């Protein structure tokens, strides 16, 4: 595909605010393509990375990292307090068809919005 | 908060097939909870394992989707291959619910974008 401005919509707990993220090129070394959203500071912005690997099995890795912006007394430079790391990896085989991969992707997309997942992630309490 | 029968909606390239999954109990050794589909064969069943750690909380989700083909001359089918998926979430002690929900829904929304669907379906980068 060709990198374009991905406009995420109605995301969040309330599902009102939106973000738009644009690409940042591809890292020549290991091929991990990167995208980010403008936030007037290069280090305080939220970033996503995606990378598919060339073989025997195909491995796809997607990382998401966003900081928390805080500005306290004692200095005029906003400081990084805490990050939010996340990563999703797929390890499909070589003879897998498109139907299975689409099934897995859609299953992940639907399951993450299920009440069990939102209860386990938002309130950080395990299932019982 | 407790685990029970959760039914995923339409699923697939055109969202045709659907899967229903039921609890398989909680493993007391490491606290991982298992969810499985009723496929009439224990060997081949779409499996989802979810766990939440304790201290810098860590959320682990693993998906295993096996597919099998009947052997040549053997009546019982043997597993052919399987697709794996791993999702890890990391948060600090001071993370708020708004941030966690925002990250969750952002990850949910990214899988519907053209970039992710093209990358996963066709295994082609940019």
């Amino acid at each position, epitope marked *: 595909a060709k990198l374009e401005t991905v*406009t995420l*919509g*109605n995301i969040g707990k309330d*599902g009102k605010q939106t973000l738009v993220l644009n690409p940042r090129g591809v890292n020549p070394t290991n091929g991990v393509a990167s995208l980010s959203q403008a936030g007037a500071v290069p280090a305080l912005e939220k970033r996503v990375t995606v990378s598919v690997s060339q073989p025997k099995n195909y491995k796809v890795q997607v990382k998401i990292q966003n900081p928390t912006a805080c500005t306290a007394n004692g200095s005029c430079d906003p400081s990084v307090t805490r990050q939010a790391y996340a990563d999703v990896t797929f390890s499909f085989t070589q003879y897998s068809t498109d139907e299975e991969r689409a099934f897995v992707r859609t299953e992940l997309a639907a399951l993450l*919005a299920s009440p069990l997942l939102i209860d386990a992630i938002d309130q950080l309490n395990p299932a019982y | 908060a407790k685990l029970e029968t959760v039914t995923l*909606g*339409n699923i697939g390239k*055109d969202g045709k097939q659907t899967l229903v999954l039921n609890p398989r109990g909680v493993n007391p050794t490491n606290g991982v909870a298992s969810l499985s589909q009723a496929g009439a064969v224990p060997a081949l069943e779409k499996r989802v394992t979810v766990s939440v750690s304790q201290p810098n909380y860590k959320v682990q989700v693993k998906i295993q989707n096996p597919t099998a083909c009947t052997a040549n001359g053997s009546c019982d089918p043997s597993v052919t291959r399987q697709a794996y998926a791993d999702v890890t979430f990391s948060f600090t002690q001071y993370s708020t619910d708004e941030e966690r929900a925002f990250v969750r829904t952002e990850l949910a929304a990214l899988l519907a974008s*053209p970039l992710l*669907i093209d990358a996963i379906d066709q295994l082609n980068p940019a």
Partner: antibody
Amino acid sequence: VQLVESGGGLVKPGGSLKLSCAASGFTFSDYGMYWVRQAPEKGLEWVAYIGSGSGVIYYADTVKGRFTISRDNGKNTLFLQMTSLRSEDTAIYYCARKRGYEYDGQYFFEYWGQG
Amino acid sequence: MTQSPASLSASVGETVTITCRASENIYNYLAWYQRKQGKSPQLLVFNAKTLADGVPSRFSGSGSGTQYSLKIISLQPEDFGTYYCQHFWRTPWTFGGG
């Protein structure tokens, strides 16, 4: 608010023809806009879905190649191209939207429009 | 590719009257849709038994797999219209009945 207009279709067993659903008093942006067919008696069925740049190919039967769908977001207007047409296709359609992002499970609300 | 018959009738008085039905494979992903012929249709109930905003309160709804019911106790006058029902589980969908 959520004022919805409709395009003009006045051609039967013939022509290509197009229909336009335009949103107003409402951000087009990300909401998944639906479609539907009425038909005069009895039969009335669901048709294709558009939620974002992708997810385009959710077509019902007899629609797989007969119809094509696209979304313009710079003007908050829908589009629909009709390749073939038979006695099946009537001239009364409606367009509706969705709560939020896709793969959640709520559908078909607020309609309004004509054909 | 499923089916969804309603098979109900009409009435004239409005104090308390009959509820609707539907039958297909299990799991409750449906809605009800008060269609007025002059105007466009509109939503009634979300997720089987949860009514949404801008609706009179006493339009009861309940059901489970293979069984659906919308109860209209404490009915208000001049609001008969015509109702339909759909399911959103598979791709093709039905969105039909009476």
